[PDB]
Design a protein around this ligand. Structure first.
Ligand SMILES: Nc1ncnc2c1ncn2[C@@H]1O[C@H](COP(=O)(O)OP(=O)(O)OP(O)(O)=S)[C@@H](O)[C@H]1O
Ligand SMILES: Nc1ncnc2c1ncn2[C@@H]1O[C@H](COP(=O)(O)OP(=O)(O)OP(O)(O)=S)[C@@H](O)[C@H]1O
Lengths: 351, 192, 350
């Protein structure tokens, strides 16, 4: 029932500069409702489910989308992680835990749980270190991908209902996964190096060879746009797992102008956080536009995304926050551009 | 003397000579007079690159005043036999035999530097002995001259009659004229 | 009477394409299995052997699809297990006997009716032996030994229904000598092992032959030359391979086969998306010129038929995002240019 424009409008409030990614998720959400809502007793049967693979630089907002999506999503949603998963029932964790975690949110409703949505952060961690199969059996690498194959395609898995009162029950519930959607996405490391070898032959020294014109060329963001499944094979992923995930989204890296919008338009911006922190203290805060332009230059230099934005702010306001509680009759604080550089002190307004 | 450089790899650092480093990137140097030892060494280099990768272009830089004909003809058949396109570049000078290996490169992948110079003439020889033996060696060198002119026309595209008149004596050709003569395709003035 | 190989093969042709060699093998096994058990077996020939099939195939070649369609046509019980959760020495993960207990659920706990059932296992390659043995290989060589007993024919203890409490403390015995097993999975890297044998090396000299082309020894044409001895180098034990004499090789995909997969099969993606838009009151059409281009893009991904949805969804993405918002839209046409991305899919209003 919800429309792609309506669902995207809600995400736009919390996410900026990821227009392509938003489209992919909106279609999946609409398709998921469409797939289930219809009886499916039509000429076409066993409708396919297109899973989603999210790729983007660090701190681009992948994990943020999963949290905001669950708020607007009515069907059950879960936020699991691929770091703790271990194959063959080892001591670490089992794959069924993802389903067991879903029932906690769904209140142990099997028919309602099969229609749920799943998110798995840090998917790159299970990638094979080398292109060739590991000599030993990796318990948190290739092995985990193998166990997910039958899960994403559709199967039945044992689920202890409620955990059980004691050994007395010793039974498990069977739940289907053929209809369950999966959103597996994580920031891959070193993927740009693999794509460069395959996109630009280069790597020559002679006259005929085309050496890179500049030191800074073939930016990380551009390479992801030209990603293909064959490139991930050299990265370590098995073709079997990738075949289960046809769609491959791309999140362009943050731009200086986007960060300025991130501090004002979003409701959870850092400016609004500290503004509320001092609001209870009876003190106001101000951030002029001239200060935001300087902060953008500093953030991209850290090559950490939006998550590295707090370091620029808090390093400045460190001294300020230390002296404000002791100080009295302080009603407003102003932070000009100079303060960010460290050549000035924030102006204070007294009552 | 030959300087040593260090190439950084994932496994570790490895020390290579300047000539060996370029060979790893499919680059061969043809320096000095063309003799049996220098020629027999280059053939092994070409074959080695063919096995490693038969689909990547090879670059051959020629700076030599020419030399023995028989040593150079072994290279011509090798360049034509293998599948990879042998790119040729002229640096400094290209004499009679140096020019033949230059034009023998792959069509469309031949370049000459802005200040390079090419010179072409007829084969040189001589013999001392009975008149019957002089006639034998004269007929033999004549076939080579005829054979070398036919191949020169084949790659340059000119007619055999034109090659006969231009190769009667020494003929110097500047870098721009080489393009107009069909010997090469373009000039690598600056990097783009 | 029981169906004939031509009739059973005709059914698979409706859902599977380009697996003529494999279809005959499966039909014969099915025909033999029905024929074997239907007869009392107290004839001139006694203790008839059971041929076990090993299905090797590239990714997305249609192995899993055959088992699903096969179960529909056959009446006898069928199960779809996986070699990922199997654990040796009865660990907490899963046991080999669990497959039998799961089989009874489909058969309603009928032992005589269960022995005539069929078994299907996937991801067999994951249980291969590893040269290095640092552990304290629970999912490798150990699982192979546990299956051998099942394939050779023996009885395994199975608690019927799980039991109400400790009181019962009993298990049912279900022979397995008559049960057929189909263990097949897409092996990874098998071409390299076979390549060393048939290539005969790459001499650098003139007379020696080298890999002139970038690719050579095509996976489809290479797997046909597979032998049991090659699988030993991969990690499988010869005893386990001895229990599976039959072997089926599958060609990855044929450019012409892909065109048929989008039109002839009932579960084709085109029919799936066509029905997806039928409820929305919009029709869909696919020109033949567009399907030829999709094949070239699909083969480039080296993912088989499963990698085809990426090409379709990548095009219709923009459409599906603006289609519900749009009104008075009665038909959509997809051209070849739309796939490349140069053009935009055409729409027809009404
Ligand atoms: N588009 C965005 N708009 C506003 N804040 C953003 C945006 N993207 C990221 N952030 C900030 O970055 C924080 C973390 O974002 P994440 O979703 O974790 O990014 P990420 O791609 O998931 O990085 P990883 O892989 O989880 S370490 C959020 O809490 C926001 O403060
Ligand atoms: N011959 C075919 N005709 C039509 N669709 C096919 C064909 N082969 C494969 N497919 C499609 O591929 C999907 C999965 O095929 P599979 O049987 O899983 O191939 P596979 O060899 O089992 O790959 P793995 O090993 O399970 S990852 C099916 O649901 C079909 O949509």
């Amino acid at each position: 029932l919800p429309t792609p424009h309506e669902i995207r409008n809600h995400l736009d409030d919390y996410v900026i500069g990821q227009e392509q990614a938003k489209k992919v998720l909106a279609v999946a959400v609409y398709n998921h409702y469409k797939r289930l809502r219809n009886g499916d007793t039509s000429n076409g049967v066993e409708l396919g489910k297109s899973n989603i693979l999210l790729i983007g630089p660090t701190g681009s907002g992948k994990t943020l989308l999963a949290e905001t999506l669950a708020r607007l999503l009515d069907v059950p949603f879960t936020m699991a992680d691929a770091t703790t998963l271990t194959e063959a029932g080892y001591v670490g964790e089992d794959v069924e835990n993802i389903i067991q975690k879903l029932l906690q949110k769904s209140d142990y409703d099997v028919q309602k749980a099969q229609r749920g949505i799943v998110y798995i952060d840090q998917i790159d961690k299970i990638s094979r270190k080398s292109d060739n199969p590991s000599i030993t059996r990796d318990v948190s690498g290739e092995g985990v991908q193998q166990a997910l194959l039958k899960l994403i395609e559709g199967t039945v898995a044992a689920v202890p209902p409620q955990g059980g009162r004691k050994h007395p029950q010793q039974e498990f519930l069977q739940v289907d996964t053929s209809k369950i959607l999966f959103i597996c996405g994580g920031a891959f490391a070193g993927l740009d190096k693999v794509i460069s070898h395959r996109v630009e032959t280069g790597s020559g020294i002679g006259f005929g060879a085309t050496v890179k014109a500049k030191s800074d060329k073939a930016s990380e963001g551009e390479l992801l746009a030209q990603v293909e499944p064959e490139d991930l094979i050299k990265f370590g992923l098995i073709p079997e797992f990738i075949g289960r995930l046809p769609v491959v989204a791309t999140l362009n890296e943050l731009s200086e102008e986007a960060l300025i919008q991130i501090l004002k338009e979003p409701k959870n911006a850092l400016t609004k956080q500290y503004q509320a922190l001092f609001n209870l203290e009876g003190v106001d805060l101000e951030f002029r536009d001239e200060a935001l332009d300087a902060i953008a230059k500093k953030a991209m230099a850290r090559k950490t995304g939006a998550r590295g934005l707090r370091s620029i702010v808090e390093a400045a306001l460190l001294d300020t926050m230390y002296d404000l509680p002791s100080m009295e009759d302080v009603e407003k604080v102003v932070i000009d551009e100079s303060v960010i550089d460290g050549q000035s002190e924030p102006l204070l307004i007294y009552g | 003397l030959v300087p040593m450089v260090i190439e950084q790899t994932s496994r570790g650092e490895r020390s290579f000579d300047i000539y060996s480093r370029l060979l790893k990137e499919r680059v061969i140097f043809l320096t000095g007079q063309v003799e049996d030892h220098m020629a027999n060494l280059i053939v092994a280099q070409m074959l080695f690159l063919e096995a490693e990768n038969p689909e990547k272009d090879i670059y051959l830089y020629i700076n030599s005043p020419g030399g023995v004909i028989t040593a150079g003809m072994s290279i011509y058949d090798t360049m034509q036999f293998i599948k990879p396109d042998v790119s040729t570049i002229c640096m400094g000078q290209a004499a009679s035999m140096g020019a033949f290996l230059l034009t023998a490169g792959a069509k469309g992948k031949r370049f000459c530097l802005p200040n390079s110079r090419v010179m072409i003439h007829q084969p040189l020889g001589g013999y001392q002995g009975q008149a019957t033996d002089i006639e034998i060696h004269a007929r033999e060198i004549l076939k080579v001259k005829g054979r070398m002119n036919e191949l020169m026309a084949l790659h340059t595209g000119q007619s055999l009659e034109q090659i006969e008149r231009d190769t009667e004596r020494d003929r110097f050709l500047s870098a721009p004229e080489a393009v107009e003569y069909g010997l090469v395709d373009s000039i690598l003035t600056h990097r783009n």
